[PDB]
Amino acid sequence: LYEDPPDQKTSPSGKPATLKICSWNVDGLRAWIKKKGLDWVKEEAPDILCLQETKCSENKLPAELQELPGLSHQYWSAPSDKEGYSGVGLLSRQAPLKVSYGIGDEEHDQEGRVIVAEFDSFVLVTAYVPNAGRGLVRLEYRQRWDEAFRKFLKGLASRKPLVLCGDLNVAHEEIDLRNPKGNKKNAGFTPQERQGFGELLQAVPLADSFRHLYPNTPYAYTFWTYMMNARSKNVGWRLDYFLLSHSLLPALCDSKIRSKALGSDHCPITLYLAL
Ligand SMILES: [Mg+2]
Structure with a gap:
């Protein structure tokens, strides 16, 4: 049910x-x-x-x-x-x-x-955000990480426009994963992680480049579990983001999800800016 647009x-x-x-x-x-x-x-x-x-x-x-x-x-x-x-x-x-x-x-x-x-004209941050872990064993640490990272990026973004990219280990909203209800107590879709992501967008502020361009597009994921043939079934999560300072929105051309690129349980994401 998903093909990334041209x-x-x-x-x-x-x-x-x-x-x-x-x-x-x-x-x-x-x-x-x-x-x-x-x-x-x-x-x-x-x-x-x-x-x-x-x-x-x-x-x-x-x-x-x-x-x-x-x-x-x-x-x-x-x-x-x-x-x-x-x-x-x-x-x-x-x-x-x-x-x-x-x-x-x-x-x-x-x-x-x-x-x-x-x-x-900009500062690029790439991040691999701590996974909350099996059984959410690391969820409390992830909450500490979320606050410290948010504060760090707010200070960074006060001096130069920011591009934050990487695996942020959260599916922000229901549209960002195939099975929201079944995962509300699993790493990547807890209320704590989702609220942290929302607070990150509001506090810095940063815009979710893909969702800004495609606000209503479902079934667009960047991660699928290796097991149970999830990728072939598109049972996935959107965990990988380009988050942009708002001043880069006039330069935003596209934010892509390279669904067919193999090599990992995540696929690449690609950002085009007119900068
Ligand atoms: Mg891995």
Whole structure:
């Protein structure tokens, strides 16, 4: 019941898109390669690629990344304790003016979850938000994360327009997942997580780029459980977002969900800006 519409590559005022950002929870950089995730990146040819759940360090990266032309500025963050879990990457054609790691809070900065890249007219944040876990074992920690992240982004957005992208591990509203009723007590659709997302949009403020453009479009998901053939059945959740400072809405051309790109239990999302 879902086919992503064609790429809209001009802005509301007819200006051509010039900046293409792709974000993807890859479920392990090495498995993602074995599952032919990198071939797709080459076709998409984004100016900036944000990756979540790399499960990799800046110390143990695959060598294919070094030969990706068009994405030669590469920044990585992995947990401070063990390796093989979480982790994020940000790869850019253009060198950012400044790259920083984490959200300025030691409590929340030990799991390789956030990279901040400052560009000329905007700041890009990519995030892998803590999953509330099986049995919601981490829901209280996730609530702490949500507040600290919100406060961090509010301060960031006070100085420069913000693009936040990544796996935010929440389906905001019922339209954002195939089975809302059955998941209201499962990670990603608890009232606590949904309210945190709503407060994030209102507080910073940020706009949900996809839902701004497609306010009434159902069955549009970016994650499906590996099990039970969920992806072939489109039993999914929209967990991956581009959230934009409002001043970037005149530059917004499109916000895509790359449903057919394989390699992970998430699919990529792609943003087009006329910037
Ligand atoms: Mg995973």
